[PDB]
Amino acid sequence: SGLRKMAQPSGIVEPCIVRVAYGSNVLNGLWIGDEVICPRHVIASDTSRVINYDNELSSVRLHNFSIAKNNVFLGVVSAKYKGVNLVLKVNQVNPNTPAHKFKSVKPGESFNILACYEGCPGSVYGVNMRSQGTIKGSFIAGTCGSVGYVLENGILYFVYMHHLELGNGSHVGSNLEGEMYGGYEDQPSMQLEGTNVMSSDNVVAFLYAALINGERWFVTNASMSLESYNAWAKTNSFTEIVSTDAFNMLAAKTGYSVEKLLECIVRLNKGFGGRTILSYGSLCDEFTPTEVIRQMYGVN
Numbered sequence: 001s002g003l004r005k006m007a008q009p010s011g012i013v014e015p016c017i018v019r020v021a022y023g024s025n026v027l028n029g030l031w032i033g034d035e036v037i038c039p040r041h042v043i044a045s046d047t048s049r050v051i052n053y054d055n056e057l058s059s060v061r062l063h064n065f066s067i068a069k070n071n072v073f074l075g076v077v078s079a080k081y082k083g084v085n086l087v088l089k090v091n092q093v094n095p096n097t098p099a100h101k102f103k104s105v106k107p108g109e110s111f112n113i114l115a116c117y118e119g120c121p122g123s124v125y126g127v128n129m130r131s132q133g134t135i136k137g138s139f140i141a142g143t144c145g146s147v148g149y150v151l152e153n154g155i156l157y158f159v160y161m162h163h164l165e166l167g168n169g170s171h172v173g174s175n176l177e178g179e180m181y182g183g184y185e186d187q188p189s190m191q192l193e194g195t196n197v198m199s200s201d202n203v204v205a206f207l208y209a210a211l212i213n214g215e216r217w218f219v220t221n222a223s224m225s226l227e228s229y230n231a232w233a234k235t236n237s238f239t240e241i242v243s244t245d246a247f248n249m250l251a252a253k254t255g256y257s258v259e260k261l262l263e264c265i266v267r268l269n270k271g272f273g274g275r276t277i278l279s280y281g282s283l284c285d286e287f288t289p290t291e292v293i294r295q296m297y298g299v300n
């Protein structure tokens with residue numbers, strides 16, 4: 001038993017991380033095949049002020065890139081923007097390149113961050129994408145270009161590359177196509193996140209996790225229909241439930257219908273009144289149904 005926010009193991013990704021520096025800027029890149037992908041602001045003269053990315057590319061010089069992995073130095077032979085990333089063709093193929101694909105995550109989906117510090121993998125942790133496209137992580141100077149990934153059916157997907165932190169502390173990055181999640185600009189900007197909408201699917205999963213753990217104080221003699229819940233969600237900054245297929249196994253194994261837990265959400269969102277659930281003091285939307293099934297029952 002127990003519920004922990006976890007990451008899938010990082011070994012397959014670690015050999016792909018390099019240090020990328022240009023001028024006084026230092027961050028991380030992803031070395032796969034004979035390409036290094038990194039945030040394009042590494043070439044900007046002054047990242048503390050609004051950047052004209054046209055001007056920074058016009059004045060770039062390929063020789064000024066410093067790219068390294070331990071005692072391997074990589075020379076850049078071509079540089080392009082691909083969205084908000086640089087794609088740098090280098091003079092050596094990474095012999096440890098794993099088989100991989102690219103995909104974009106969606107709001108409510110979980111993935112893993114390999115947090116990298118000026119080219120050195122430092123830590124690994126799980127995240128969940130918020131409705132506005134942000135994540136809540138722990139990123140500091142030197143961590144841009146840290147990589148998000150997910151393993152799904154024996155396939156490694158690269159899904160995220162880190163760029164910035166909003167004034168409210170939320171973390172912003174791009175897919176590996178260089179499309180910023182949420183559409184935020186790669187600028188030092190007071191751009192606003194927008195209103196956060198909780199993932200109902202994930203809150204339901206969290207309550208199922210508490211039931212699996214043997215905690216059931218919060219369940220009442222009541223149950224809310226799906227249309228009723230969805231009408232409430234729309235006015236209370238929760239997502240509408242579009243399918244209950246993700247909960248069939250959880251309902252079957254716990255004996256509790258999704259509608260019982262929908263009633264719990266509406267009631268608990270008013271406050272836990274000093275109680276906790278899985279030691280939390282408020283509802284948590286960080287765990288997907290898949291995450292809960294996998295770590296609590298060991299299947300899928």
Ligand SMILES: *[C@@](O)(CO)[C@H](C[C@@H]1CCNC1=O)NC(=O)[C@H](CC(C)C)NC(=O)c1cc2c(OC)cccc2[nH]1
Nearest residue numbers: 139140141142143144163164165166167186187188189
């Ligand atoms: C990368 O390491 C840079 O290479 C860095 C990561 C952030 C540092 C603190 N937490 C992080 O996630 N990214 C930045 O420093 C970016 C660089 C931009 C995109 C060119 N800037 C910010 O994240 C940033 C600047 C400002 C700001 O200014 C003015 C005002 C409000 C928020 C804000 N975020």
